[PDB]
C-alpha cells in the first residue's frame, strides 16, 4: 500500500509497459563501444544515436539509466527483437531476479541493494542485462552503480573485457553486482556486530524493534538472494551456444560467490535467531534474579512480621511475662533464624 | 594500491626456513636461517619440501616465490592472510590456501593460522606465518622412514600436507566436542549469566570453523575430479579419500551447530526451573504464615466481651492451632507436590 | 607515460656512478622497474630490478652483491648507485617500467607474467 | 641456477612482403612468459608482443606469435624496409631474466 506492493499492472495485458518503479525523474544513456584495440564511449540523451550498435559485431555496452520513459525502452525493445514480456519483465521492479534463455538474447535480471546506516532500510534498484550476441543492453532506473570498477576497466585496458567479447562483459557486470552484495554483507555483519554487543552487554525495550527490524530487512535480501543460486546455475549448466564456452569457468566463480552470499545470508538469520533468543534468556534472568530478591526478603523478614504479630497479643496469663527485666526475649529468635535462613539461602544458591 | 604485495596478518615474531630433501633410498635435512642455498633444490630431481615458516619477511617470500616460478599476485594471495581455502591450478605449479585453527581452551579463543601450499612436480614450498605447525606426522614418516612416502613423488607429499591438515582439523573437532561437553555438564546445573556468553562464543567459533571448512569441499572436489597435470594420476583415490575426511568433518560440524542452537533453549528451560524453585518457596512461605496470621492477628483486636482472657491456656490452645493448621498446609502441599 | 634517463660518460674502472631515471605519468610506488644493459655491439641482458613497494631490490647473479639500487617516490624516480665498477660494465642502459594483465577468481586463473612496455632513453657508460 | 634461453636465427635475410619467423627456446619450460622485443640501432627498443599470444597496443596487427610447449615462434606477416632491427625473446618466468641471443635482419 506503500507502493512497495505489486498493485502495478492487475489485468493489463502482458504487452503493457506500466513502470512499476517509482524513481522517475533522471534518464541518459552510458554507451561504450570497445573492441581488441578500439574504445568509444560517450553520455547520450537521444535514443537514436545508440541503435547503429547493434548490427556492429564489436561488442558494446549500452546502459540505459532511467527507464521510467517508456518510449525509449519500448523503441530499443522494438528494434532489438526483444520480447514484449521481456519488457514487461524490464518495467517491473518488483520482479524476481531470473534468467531466459532465447534464440536471439540472453535476458537477466539482478537486484541492486543498498543500505544506509542509522535507520535499518535496504533499498533496491531493478537492473537487467539483454545480451544479443554483439551488445549487452543494461537498463537502470536512476544513477548511482556498482559497476565503476567495471568502467574502469574497460576505460584503461586493465584485466580481459577489453579483449573479451560481450559474454565476459556481461560476466564482468554479474561480478560487480557480487562485489556489490559481498560489501552490503559486510556492512550487514558490522549490524550483526552491533546488534550482539547491545544484547549483551545493554538489553533494553527498543533492542527487540532493533532485531525484529533487522529480522524483516534480512529476510528480505534472502528473497533476493535465494533466485541468485538458481540464476547462476542457469548460466552454467545447459549453456546456449550464445555465451562462450571459454567464459564458463567465470561463470563457475561467480556461481560459488553466489553460493557463499547465500551461506552468509543463512548463517546471518542463525545469528540473529540466537540474538532474539538471548533476549529472551537475559529478561528470563533478570526475572529469576528479581523473584529472588524479593522472596529472600519474604522469607527472612516475613515469618519476623508473623513472630511480632503473634507474640504481642491482648492475652493475660500467658508465659511471656518480663521475667528477663528488659522485653527482648524474642528478638534472640528473629535474629538466629534470619541468621539460619540466610545462610540456608546462601548454601541454595540465592543471592 | 592495485596488485600489490604486502603481508595483511598479524603475527610478526621470526622465520625459520627448512627444508627436507626425500628421495626413494636417501634423504638429507639442510634447515638454515638464510633465503640462499636452498633455491638450487628447484631443479633436483628428487623432490624437495622447502617450509617458510614465517612469511613476516617479505623478501624472503618474494625471492622464492619469483625464483621458483610463482607469480607475483599468487605471492599477494600467500602473503594475504584474510583469504579463505583456495586452490588455483597453473601450467606449472598447484597453489593452495589452507587454514589450520588453533584453541586457546583457558580462556576459549579459536585462531586461525594460513598455510599456503605451491606444488611444483620437484618441490613443495609451504608459506607460513607462525614457527610452530601441526605436520609431525609427514615430517616422522620422511625422517624415520616409517612411511611408504618415500618413493611417491611430489604429489604423495602435497597428500600427506593435505592428511595432515585434516587430522588436525579432527582433532579440532574433539577439543570442541569437549568444550560442548564442558558447557552441557556446566549448563543445566550451574545456570548463570555469563553462559549465555559462553555459548554465543561458542556459535561464533562454530561459524568461523563452517565458513573455513566448507571451502575446503570444495578445493578437494577440485583437487581429485579435475586431476591436474601435476598430480600423478595415481594419487587421485588418495584425495577422493581426503574428500570423504572433509565432508565427515563437515556433517559433524553441522550436528554440532545444531546442537548448539538446541543448547540455549535447554538453558532457557533450565532457568525457567530455577525461578521456579524459588517460586514455590515463596508460595510455601506465604501459605503457611499468611493464612497463618488472622489467629495471631484477630487475636490482637482491641475489644473487650470476648473469651480473650477466660481460657484452659488459651495463649497455649492458640499455639496448638497454630501447629495444627500449619502441619494442615504442609500436608496440603506436600501430597500433592506443591514443591 | 615517459621514462628519461641522465648521467651518461666515462669513468676510471673501479670508480662509482649514479644513473637516475625519471618516470612521468605513472607512480613508482605500487610499480615495478628494470634496469638492463647493452654491450656495445653485443646482445642485451637484464641487470637489476626494482619493486619499490616493499623496497625490493634484485641483481642479476653476474653482477651479484656489487650494485645498489633503489626508487625515490617523491620525485618519482628511479636511482641505481653503480660501484665496484668492472671493465666488462661499460655499456648502454636502460630503464623500463615492467607490467601485467591479470584476472582474478577463474579456477584457472589467467595470470601474465611481467614484460617491459616503457623503455627508457638510454644511457652510454664507457670504463 | 642461470637459464639458457636461445633464439635462431643470429641472422637472417628477408625480402619485403615475406613470411619471416624467428624460433626461440629455453632449457626449462617458462610458461608463456616470453616476450618479443624489437631494437633498432638508434632507437630504445619495444615490446611488440608479451606472454607469446597477446599483440601490444600500437604494434600493427603483422606480427604473431604462436606456443609449442618449450619452443616459442615469432612470425611476421610481410615485412616493410621500414622496420628492419634486431629482435630478442625475454623470458620472464624465472625472476633471473634471460634475453635472445639477438637476430638481427636488413633490407634484402
Known amino acids: 500500500m506503500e507502493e512497495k506492493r505489486l498493485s502495478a499492472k492487475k489485468g493489463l495485458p502482458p504487452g503493457t509497459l506500466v513502470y512499476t518503479g517509482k524513481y522517475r525523474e533522471d534518464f541518459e544513456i552510458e554507451v561504450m563501444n570497445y573492441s581488441i584495440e578500439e574504445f568509444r564511449e560517450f553520455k547520450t540523451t537521444d535514443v537514436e544515436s545508440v541503435l547503429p550498435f547493434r548490427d556492429s559485431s564489436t561488442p558494446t555496452w549500452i546502459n540505459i539509466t532511467g527507464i521510467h520513459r517508456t518510449d525509449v525502452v519500448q523503441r530499443v525493445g522494438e528494434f532489438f527483437g526483444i520480447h514484449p514480456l521481456v519488457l514487461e519483465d524490464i518495467l517491473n521492479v518488483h520482479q524476481r531476479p531470473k534468467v531466459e534463455f532465447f534464440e536471439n538474447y540472453v535476458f537477466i535480471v539482478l537486484k541492486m541493494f543498498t543500505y544506509d546506516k542509522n535507520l535499518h532500510e535496504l533499498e533496491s534498484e531493478q537492473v537487467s542485462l539483454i545480451l544479443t550476441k554483439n551488445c549487452v543492453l543494461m537498463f537502470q532506473e536512476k544513477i548511482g552503480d556498482v559497476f565503476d570498477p567495471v568502467r574502469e576497466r574497460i576505460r584503461y585496458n586493465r584485466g580481459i573485457i577489453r579483449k573479451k567479447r560481450a559474454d565476459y562483459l556481461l560476466y564482468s557486470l554479474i561480478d560487480a553486482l557480487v562485489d556489490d552484495y559481498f560489501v552490503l554483507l559486510e556492512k550487514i555483519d558490522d549490524e550483526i556486530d552491533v546488534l550482539e554487543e547491545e544484547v549483551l552487554e545493554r538489553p533494553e525495550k527498543e533492542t527487540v524493534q532493533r532485531t525484529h527490524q533487522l529480522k524483516r530487512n534480512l529476510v528480505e535480501l534472502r528473497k533476493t538472494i535465494w533466485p541468485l543460486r538458481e540464476v547462476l546455475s542457469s548460466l552454467y549448466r545447459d549453456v546456449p551456444p550464445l555465451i562462450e564456452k571459454e567464459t564458463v569457468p567465470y561463470f563457475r566463480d561467480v556461481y560459488d560467490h553466489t553460493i557463499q552470499i547465500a551461506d552468509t545470508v543463512e548463517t546471518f538469520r542463525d545469528i540473529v535467531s540466537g540474538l532474539l533468543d538471548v533476549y529472551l534468556s537475559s529478561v528470563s534472568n533478570k526475572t529469576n534474579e528479581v523473584m529472588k530478591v524479593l522472596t529472600i526478603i519474604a522469607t527472612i523478614f516475613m515469618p519476623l512480621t508473623f513472630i511480632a504479630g503473634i507474640y504481642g497479643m491482648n492475652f493475660e496469663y500467658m508465659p511471656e511475662l518480663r521475667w528477663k527485666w528488659g522485653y527482648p526475649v524474642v528478638l534472640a529468635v528473629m535474629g538466629v533464624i534470619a541468621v539460619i535462613m540466610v545462610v540456608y539461602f546462601k548454601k541454595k544458591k540465592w543471592l | 594500491p592495485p596488485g600489490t604485495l604486502v603481508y595483511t596478518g598479524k603475527y610478526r615474531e621470526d622465520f625459520e626456513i627448512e627444508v627436507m630433501n626425500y628421495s626413494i633410498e636417501e634423504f638429507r635435512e639442510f634447515k638454515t636461517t638464510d633465503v640462499e642455498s636452498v633455491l638450487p633444490f628447484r631443479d633436483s630431481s628428487t623432490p624437495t619440501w622447502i617450509n617458510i615458516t614465517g612469511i613476516h619477511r617479505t623478501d624472503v617470500v618474494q625471492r622464492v616465490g619469483e625464483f621458483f616460478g610463482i607469480h607475483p599476485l599468487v605471492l599477494e594471495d600467500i602473503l594475504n592472510v584474510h583469504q579463505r581455502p583456495k586452490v588455483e591450478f597453473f601450467e606449472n605449479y598447484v597453489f593452495i590456501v589452507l587454514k589450520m585453527f588453533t584453541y586457546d581452551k583457558n580462556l576459549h579463543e579459536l585462531e586461525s593460522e594460513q598455510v599456503s601450499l605451491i606444488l611444483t612436480k620437484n618441490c613443495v614450498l609451504m608459506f607460513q606465518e607462525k614457527i610452530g605447525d601441526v605436520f609431525d606426522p609427514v615430517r616422522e614418516r620422511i625422517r624415520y622412514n616409517r612411511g611408504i612416502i618415500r618413493k611417491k613423488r611430489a604429489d604423495y607429499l602435497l597428500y600427506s600436507l593435505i592428511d595432515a591438515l585434516v587430522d588436525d582439523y579432527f582433532v579440532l573437532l574433539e577439543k570442541i566436542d569437549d568444550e560442548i561437553d564442558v558447557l552441557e555438564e556446566e549448563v543445566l546445573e550451574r545456570p548463570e549469566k555469563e553462559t549465555v556468553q559462553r555459548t554465543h562464543q561458542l556459535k561464533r567459533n562454530l561459524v568461523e570453523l563452517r565458513k573455513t571448512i566448507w571451502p575446503l569441499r570444495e578445493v578437494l572436489s577440485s583437487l581429485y575430479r579435475d586431476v591436474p597435470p601435476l598430480i600423478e594420476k595415481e594419487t587421485v583415490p588418495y584425495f577422493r579419500d581426503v574428500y570423504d575426511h572433509t565432508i565427515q568433518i563437515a556433517d559433524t560440524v553441522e550436528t554440532f551447530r545444531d546442537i548448539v542452537s538446541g543448547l540455549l533453549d535447554v538453558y532457557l528451560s533450565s532457568v525457567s526451573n530455577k525461578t521456579n524453585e524459588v517460586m514455590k518457596v515463596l508460595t510455601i512461605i506465604a501459605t503457611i504464615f499468611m493464612p497463618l496470621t488472622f489467629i495471631a492477628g484477630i487475636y490482637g483486636m482491641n475489644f473487650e466481651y470476648m473469651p480473650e482472657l477466660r481460657w484452659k491456656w488459651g495463649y497455649p490452645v492458640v499455639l496448638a492451632v497454630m501447629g495444627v493448621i500449619a502441619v494442615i498446609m504442609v500436608v496440603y502441599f506436600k501430597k500433592k507436590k506443591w514443591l | 607515460v615517459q621514462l628519461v634517463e641522465s648521467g651518461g660518460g666515462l669513468v676510471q674502472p673501479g670508480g662509482s656512478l649514479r644513473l637516475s631515471c625519471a618516470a612521468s605519468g605513472f607512480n613508482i610506488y605500487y610499480s615495478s622497474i628494470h634496469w638492463v644493459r647493452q654491450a656495445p655491439g653485443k646482445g642485451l641482458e637484464w641487470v637489476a630490478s626494482?619493486?619499490?613497494?616493499?623496497?625490493?631490490?634484485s641483481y642479476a647473479d653476474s653482477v651479484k652483491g656489487r650494485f645498489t639500487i633503489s626508487a625515490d617516490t617523491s620525485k618519482n624516480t628511479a636511482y641505481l648507485q653503480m660501484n665496484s665498477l668492472r671493465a666488462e660494465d661499460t655499456a648502454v642502459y636502460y630503464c623500463a617500467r615492467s607490467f601485467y594483465v591479470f584476472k582474478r577468481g577463474t579456477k584457472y586463473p589467467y595470470y601474465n607474467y611481467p614484460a617491459m612496455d616503457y623503455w627508457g632513453q638510454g644511457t652510454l657508460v664507457t670504463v | 641456477s642461470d637459464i639458457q634461453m636461445t633464439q635462431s636465427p643470429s641472422s637472417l635475410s628477408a625480402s619485403v612482403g615475406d613470411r619471416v619467423t624467428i624460433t626461440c627456446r629455453a632449457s626449462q619450460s617458462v610458461s608463456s612468459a616470453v616476450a618479443w622485443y624489437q631494437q633498432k640501432p638508434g632507437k630504445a627498443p619495444k615490446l611488440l608482443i608479451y606472454?607469446?599470444?597477446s599483440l601490444y597496443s600500437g604494434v600493427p596487427s603483422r606480427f604473431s606469435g604462436s606456443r609449442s610447449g618449450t619452443d616459442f615462434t615469432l612470425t611476421i606477416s610481410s615485412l616493410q624496409p621500414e622496420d628492419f632491427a634486431t629482435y630478442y625473446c625475454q623470458q620472464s618466468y624465472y625472476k633471473p631474466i634471460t634475453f635472445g641471443q639477438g637476430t638481427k635482419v636488413e633490407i634484402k
Open positions: 626494482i619493486y619499490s613497494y616493499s623496497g625490493y631490490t
Open positions: 606472454s607469446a599470444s
